[PDB]
Design a protein around this ligand. Sequence first.
Ligand code: IY1
Ligand SMILES: OC[C@H]1O[C@@](CO)(O[C@H]2O[C@H](CO)[C@@H](O)[C@H](O)[C@H]2O)[C@@H](O)[C@@H]1O
Ligand code: NH4
Lengths: 553, 415
Amino acid sequence: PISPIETVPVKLKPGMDGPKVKQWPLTEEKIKALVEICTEMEKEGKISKIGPENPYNTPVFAIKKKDSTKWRKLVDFRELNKRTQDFWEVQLGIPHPAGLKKKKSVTVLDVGDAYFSVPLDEDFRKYTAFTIPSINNETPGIRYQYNVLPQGWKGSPAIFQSSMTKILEPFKKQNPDIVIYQYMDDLYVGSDLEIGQHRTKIEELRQHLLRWGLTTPDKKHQKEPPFLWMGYELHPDKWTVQPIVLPEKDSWTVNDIQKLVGKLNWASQIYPGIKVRQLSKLLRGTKALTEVIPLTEEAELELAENREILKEPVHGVYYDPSKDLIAEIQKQGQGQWTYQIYQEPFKNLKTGKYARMRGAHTNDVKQLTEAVQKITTESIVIWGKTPKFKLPIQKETWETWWTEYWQATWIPEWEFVNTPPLVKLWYQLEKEPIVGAETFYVDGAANRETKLGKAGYVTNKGRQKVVPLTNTTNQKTELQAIYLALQDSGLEVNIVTNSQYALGIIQAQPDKSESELVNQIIEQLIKKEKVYLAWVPAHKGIGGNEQVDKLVS
Amino acid sequence: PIETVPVKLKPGMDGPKVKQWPLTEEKIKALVEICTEMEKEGKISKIGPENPYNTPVFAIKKKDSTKWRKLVDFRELNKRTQDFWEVQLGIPHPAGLKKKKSVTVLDVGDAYFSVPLDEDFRKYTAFTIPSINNETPGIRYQYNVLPQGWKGSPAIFQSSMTKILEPFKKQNPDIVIYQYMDDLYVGSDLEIGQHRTKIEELRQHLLRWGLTPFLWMGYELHPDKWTVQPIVLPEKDSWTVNDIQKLVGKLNWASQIYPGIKVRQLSKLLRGTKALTEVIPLTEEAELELAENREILKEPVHGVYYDPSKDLIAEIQKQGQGQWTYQIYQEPFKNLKTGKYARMRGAHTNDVKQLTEAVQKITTESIVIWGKTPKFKLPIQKETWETWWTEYWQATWIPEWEFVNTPPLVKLWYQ
DNA sequence: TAACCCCCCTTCGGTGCTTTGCACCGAAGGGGGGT
Ligand SMILES: Cn1c2ccccc2c2c1cc(C#N)c(=O)n2-c1ccc([N+](=O)[O-])cc1
Ligand SMILES: OC[C@H]1O[C@@](CO)(O[C@H]2O[C@H](CO)[C@@H](O)[C@H](O)[C@H]2O)[C@@H](O)[C@@H]1O
Ligand SMILES: [N+]
């Protein structure tokens, strides 16, 4: 005698009616095997037959279980999903083995036929109607409606998942000494009890589920490590990911690299040093998934270095709340950053990488701050606290940055680790004009129609230059003018401009840019010894600003 | 046995659907304990995923407070909730509160937990408590009473509030009392010792209703000591070309605020093409212009005043060395107030804590002066602010904000 | 020939000020993973 699960009220979107889509042409191979399952569900109580008074319908079909002789049945409720009320998902994230505390006894079991053990809403079962062709639609055919949560309905995951929590709620309160990680129907159970009391605790829970109609088939009951859980392998003192499949195909399409880079990201959670910059660079462009891509020299070298990391097996450890969390970051170049999170040296809880390039112009300090932020949020999710950081940047470098930057920025408690390449600021702008340094009044202009322009400067010593430019913009000529002044000045120079655009970029001390021109300006700034940038308003009759504006306009 | 005040949303607007953000261990444990006690006491009830609404929740510790407090980010719900001024449940603002020598802020939100809430509106107060490492899916709740931090709670409770304060107000006719969100502002011109005494009077006066996070805390303000930060022009005896260029640029920016400012005679000093460090003396015409511009910066702007129907906007600039400037306005370049903060908590070590402090200081001043909280333009990168601001938040309300990046070309608000 | 969830890389269009160019950023759509 099972206990009935209270149904969850489900509605359609206001002013909308059930789905009426009828059926797609079905091959006889599928039409046959389906009718066998229809009767099985009717006998088992999963489905009801009566549907002549039901004007709604949703297509049905089936395909093969992954590399199995069995046919998998699924309903395309995409039309009903549009008409179904919106749900708030209670699944907020994916649990991670690096967050598991070591438990003396562990068990992993699943619920048999989860969706089909949860009663659908009494009033809503009518909208799940579906029709199967008897024999190629020769005869009307058998119609059915779901009495339980069907696969493919946007509300099934949230409803089952929440029902699972109410069922587990009493057991956990009456057994606080146990830890249960519930992910859908997959359950992780661990305790420091003796294996005997553990199997007793397991059977108390295993019966607690059957009372509410939830079976626990021994086909999915794991009692001996390594436990297969969430795509990992759980050993008593270590964990690792289930083996990864690296495509070795010698002819790479667009979709080949997408699948390739995808698996490398998944591997980067424990395999240190994974890089996907050059491989993903091949993917940039609105090219179809079928186009074959020749691997560049760097993209081929990056893939080789990844094989060197993945050829060797790596393991992760478990979390110890008594010890502090340590996060260490290393610079990999080209805006790539890798990190490791650990509590004791060389026994990593997990690893990761940050390679996001945000903004056309940036520097290593900004990217390091962003890597720290990603790690921080990731750590609060898995462990609920912020780790201590070991960063390849000197305290002096960071202080100079955050104290001078006009935007508020901060890094949590951290210490410097001398692990080249170090992060540094490649140049620093003066705060006051340099005495005895030539003053370049720069300016630029571009004809909006012809796209032609000029860039140049005039100096206090009578030095002048004007340069013609083709296929340019006002903004580009303003940067070009500054570049000219840096090229044509000594190691110390004062530069006066009215380009708010140019000053905003340069004052942020970028060390890398998507703009060829900005990178050339950076190259000049790194060579200088003193550079004072000053802004003045345009068209106000100021100094050489009015003079150079004439030359270039 | 108390009937519930019906509340609707603004027509044509759905409910709040804001995802819960990750919480630290200490914040989740404090929430579980708090929500456990609130469920026992009937103030909240668990719900399922059939409720499509959600509002972020987290916890704070107020200034010099060691116990956790629960805070719900009802910003999305407050914007979607019907304005109670149109329902005529709006609370007027006393222009004399900012004039009192001392103002104490009392957390009275705890009293909201006694009034029931409109049943049809309870589904909009849904929130989700997360778990570390996603061990358990989200645990969802909803409110059965007036929730703290909701803009309708002080409006619905206003009728009960005026009753409880009637004895205190009529025995002390000079003390001003203003209610905003879960806080009560009580200002007086009395002596500090007598002010704190009359505050304790109102505390036990509040017990005489609660007898028929907690009430005990109180923070003292002094709005009569609040000053403004005016635009200042340096005074030099000798000026370099760079000095006059900076001056001309600053005055050109300032002319958008003060229309009477002129820079013609000062620009002529920059006619040639000179080295930035060259000292050049002022012409007789330029000396009058500089002095005249300072006068114009001494007087207030013409036709700038507070419009109750317009929203308040606050801009903040990081000036370095723990200095932070801000301006409050409703129309661009028509500033209602300009100010500067310095030596706040976190100065010289933590930019986010200083900015969080500045946001709270400025909001408090806007509530006292206009009874409105401003929408903030924050000088910070979105991800940086979102990663840290809850670690330093110490108020029971949360203002609206957006993220700006304005490089300082001219030092306008701070020399 | 699909349901929900987390992540990364790319493109792209919407937004605003650096203006009718250029940059910031969130939504998708690709991929990886989980049930
Ligand atoms: C590829 N795949 C899967 C792959 C592995 C496991 C489940 C699914 C799956 C799917 C796909 C769907 C769909 N639609 C689906 O509903 N499920 C599913 C998930 C959980 C349960 N249950 O807990 O009972 C039922 C169906
Ligand atoms: O609201 C969405 C999302 O944006 C953030 C970013 O800081 O800011 C908003 O937060 C409020 C909801 O909590 C919005 O109502 C408000 O308009 C805005 O400040 C986050 O706070 C929020 O998660
Ligand atoms: N110009």
